[PDB]
Amino acid sequence: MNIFEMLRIDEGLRLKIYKDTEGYYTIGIGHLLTKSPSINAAKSELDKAINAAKSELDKAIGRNTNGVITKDEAEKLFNQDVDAAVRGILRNAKLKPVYDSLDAVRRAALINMVFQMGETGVAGFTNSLRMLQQKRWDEAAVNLAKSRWYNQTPNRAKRVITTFRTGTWDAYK
Known part of the structure; x- marks a missing residue:
């Protein structure tokens, strides 16, 4: 067991944009995208957000995906994320x-x-x-x-x- 496997378990895996317990739009292995809005919001809102999350994703991956990614892609994001966390700590x-x-x-x-x-x-x-x-x-x-x-x-x-x-x-x- 190691950090990767550990967080793999705790964070799960998802290839489609979902939202976390804390109302954040996320994907892959806990990859944060955008703060979600409250349901009291309508199209204007919601879609705007979906939109935004979507853009974040594209930006992250470097391609148009319509809110869906591959395992390889997630794993990539994942590594980058572990890395980052490990840098914050040292910084x-x-x-x-x-x-x-x-x-x-x-x-x-x-x-x-x-x-x-x-x-x-x-x-x-x-x-x-x-x-x-x-x-x-x-x-x-x-x-x-x-x-x-x-x-x-x-x-x-x-x-x-x-x-x-x-x-x-x-x-x-």
């Missing part, structure tokens, strides 16, 4: 250090968070981060759980948390 004054202190498995967990919630979002978990740095496994997990993230996506948060707590991939077995 971040708060993440870099936590990251460095962690074992390979746990590193993976951090990347996941980052990938799921952006470097900005993640750096926001100051207490949890510190705890991670002190290697206070269980405390962190408790801290981590007291979050929007957990409450919103519990199953996924669970796997991640456990991962941090055990330094193993059991949660993913």
